[PDB]
Amino acid sequence: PVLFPGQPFGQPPLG
Amino acid sequence: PIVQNLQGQMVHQAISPRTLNAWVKVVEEKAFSPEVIPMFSALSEGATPQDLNTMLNTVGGHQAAMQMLKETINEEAAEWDRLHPVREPRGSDIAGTTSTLQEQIGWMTHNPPIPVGEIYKRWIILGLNKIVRMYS
C-alpha cells in the first residue's frame, strides 16, 4: 500500500 | 497552497500557522460531526499534497478513524495506478509520500493542470465522509 498502519500521512516508505 | 497573488500569478505559499491552529481546534472541538468536512475544505483551499499531510498529521487521539482514512487513501491510490498505465504522478505521488513539493507544484501548475492537491483532497474527503458516517 501507499500508507502502512503507523506510517504517518506523507511519510516516504522505509522500503 | 497555490494561490493567485495580486499580480494574478499562481504562486506557492507555505500553509500558515494560523490555518494549522484552526484545523487543530476543529478536530479538538468537533471530533467528526458533519461540519468537520466543511471546515477541512475551507482551510485547505489550493492545498498541495504536502499541505494536506501537514493537516492530517496534527490529528491526535483518533487512531481507528485515521486508520480508516489511510485505508481509503490506499484504495483510491491503487485504483489511480490501475487507471493510469505506467514524469506523470502515481498514487503515492498524489498522496505526497514519493513526490517532492516542487513536483507537486509542477503538476498543479501544469498546462493543463494535473491537479494533485484536488485529487488527494477528494480521496481524503471520501475518507472523512466514511468516518463521519460511522460517528453518526
Residue numbers in the entry:
A (entry chain B): 322 to 336
B (entry chain A): 1 to 86, 97 to 146
How is this structure described in the published paper?
We therefore synthesised a peptide corresponding to this putative HIV-1-interacting region (CPSF6313–327) and tested binding to recombinant HIV-1 CA N-terminal domain (CAN) by isothermal titration calorimetry (ITC). CPSF6313–327 is highly hydrophobic, containing only two polar residues (Q319 and Q323). The aromatic side chain of F321 forms extensive hydrophobic interactions with CA, suggesting that it may be essential for CPSF6:CA binding. Mutation N74D is located at the centre of the CPSF6-binding interface and abolishes binding of CPSF6313–327 to CA. We have shown that CA residue N74 makes an essential interaction with CPSF6, both by solving the crystal structure of a CPSF6:CA complex and by showing that mutation N74D abolishes binding to CPSF6. Five residues were selected for mutation (N57, Q67, K70, N74 and T107), on the basis that (1) they bind CPSF6 via their side chain and not their main chain and (2) are not obviously involved in maintaining CA structure. We also made an additional M66F mutation in order to occlude the hydrophobic pocket filled by CPSF6 residue F321. Modelling of this mutant on to our structure suggested that the only F66 rotamer that would permit normal HIV-1 folding would be one that resulted in a steric clash with F321. One mutation, T107A, resulted in an increased affinity to the drug (Kd = 1 µM), possibly due to the removal of a slight steric repulsion between one of the aromatic moieties in PF-3450074 and the T107 side chain. These data show that PF-3450074 occupies only one pocket within a larger protein interface bound by CPSF6. In this context, it is important to note that the interaction of CPSF6313–327 with CA, whilst specific, occurs with weak affinity.
The HIV-1 genome enters target cells encapsulated in a fullerene capsid cone composed of capsid (CA) protein. CPSF6 is a pre-mRNA processing protein that dynamically shuttles between the nucleus and the cytoplasm and contains a C-terminal nuclear-targeting arginine/serine-rich (RS-) domain of the type bound by TNPO3. Here we show that CPSF6 binds specifically to a novel protein-protein interface on the N-terminal domain of HIV-1 CA. Finally, addition of an ectopic nuclear localization signal (NLS) to CPSF6-358 recovers its nuclear localization and restores HIV-1 infectivity, suggesting that the functional outcome of CPSF6 interaction with HIV-1 depends on whether CPSF6 is trafficking into the nucleus or remaining in the cytosol. Together, our data reveals that HIV-1 CA possesses a previously undescribed, conserved protein-protein interface that dictates cofactor dependence.
